[PDB]
Amino acid sequence: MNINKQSPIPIYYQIMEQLKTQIKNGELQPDMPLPSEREYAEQFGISRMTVRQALSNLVNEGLLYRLKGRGTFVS
Amino acid sequence: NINKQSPIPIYYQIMEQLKTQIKNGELQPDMPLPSEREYAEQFGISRMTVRQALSNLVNEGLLYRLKGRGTFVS
Amino acid sequence: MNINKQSPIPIYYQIMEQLKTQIKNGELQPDMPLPSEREYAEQFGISRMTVRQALSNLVNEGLLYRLKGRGTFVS
Amino acid sequence: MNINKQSPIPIYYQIMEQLKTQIKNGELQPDMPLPSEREYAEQFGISRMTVRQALSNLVNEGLLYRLKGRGTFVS
DNA sequence: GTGGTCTAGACCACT
DNA sequence: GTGGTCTAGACCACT
Ligand SMILES: [Cl-]
Ligand SMILES: [Cl-]
């Protein structure tokens, strides 16, 4: 994955779309954990809350779920 | 109004306070809420802490936002 | 720092010129943050949009740069 | 600062004692922040909850105070 | 002059 | 060692 920080397109939305592709692809397996929020933040070089905005929307769209204390998973 | 020392998250306390204000007609359909910045100053908390409460109420359909203008009771 | 709201000279331009003065003599030190867009707007009693036009112009002239989520700095 | 995971002495207590030493000889001074709970946990290879037990005890004894979103500080 | 996005971290709750 | 909540602001999009 790669985000473009100088795009008017919000970083969180860029992340959303790329994750959506991997979900519909099987590149991210169902009931298997995504990389942690801190892993994503580190690799994208962005704030964890920016990552979280994306993940929270995908959770709200029913594409992911969270298990507190454990991780974030493909629905 | 809120208790910042409670284990109960601030944003949730705000949610319930607002829910309470919507029922007893202290807040009625289409009237505007104080700005996010007003709330944060009123409570001595961060604006994002206010936003978590308001976004949850928006997502629950109890409030709606007009981009660039304000937040209102549904 | 003063702005004249009844001058035919656009507010954003008045701001640009006073900021250039402060940059030139060092009242705004290089690589140090300016007052927030917020601070300028509230002090002058104007729109943030108007402040941004001034600031964006200076960014385009290479006098200032912006770092998202942190501030506006003198190059 | 060192811990021994194989000692019968609880890790959180080992941490408490060394922090008390560091405070007494001035390595940690009043109103200055400690390393983050994360920093301690990662460097010793332990859970944050273990670090938190040490820190919570020192807060309870009045030697440290915490500010949400900011840090942990010597009282 | 509001809501939207973002920074660069912190401590808290919890199999 | 994760997700959850929070700080204390900033600039960006926009009737
Ligand atoms: Cl602001
Ligand atoms: Cl952390």
Author numbering:
A (entry chain B), C (entry chain C), D (entry chain A): 1 to 75
B (entry chain D): 2 to 75
Give sentences from the paper.
In order to obtain more detailed insight into the DNA-binding determinants of NagR, we also solved the crystal structure of isolated NagR–DBDs in complex with an idealized 15mer palindromic operator dre-site at a resolution of 1.9 Å. Although the dsDNA fragment used for crystallization was designed to contain only a single palindromic dre-site, we observe not two but four NagR–DBD molecules bound to the dsDNA fragment in the structure of the complex. The centrally bound NagR–DBDs interact closely with the sequence-specific recognition half-sites of the palindromic dsDNA with the sequence 5′-GTGGTCTAGACCAC-3′. While each NagR–DBD molecule contacts two contiguous segments of dsDNA, namely the nucleotides −7 to −4 from one strand and −3 to −1 from the opposite strand, sequence-specific interactions are restricted to the −7 to −4 segment and more precisely to bases G−7, G−5 and G−4. Thus, the wing motif reaches into the minor groove and contacts G−7 via the carbonyl oxygen of Gly69. The bases G−5 and G−4 are specifically recognized by Arg38 and Arg48, respectively. The DBDs bound at the edges of the dsDNA fragment lack most base-specific interactions since only the wing anchoring via Gly69 is conserved.
NagR, formerly termed YvoA, has been identified as a repressor protein from Bacillus subtilis that regulates genes involved in N-acetylglucosamine (GlcNAc) utilization. NagR acts as a negative transcriptional regulator, and binding of effector-free NagR to specific DNA operator sites blocks gene transcription. With more than 49000 deposited sequences, the GntR family of regulators (gluconate-operon repressor, Pfam family: PF00392) represents one of the largest groups of bacterial metabolite-responsive transcription factors. Their tertiary structure can be subdivided in almost all cases into two distinct domains: an N-terminal DNA-binding winged-helix-turn-helix (wHTH) domain and a C-terminal small-molecule effector-binding and oligomerization domain.
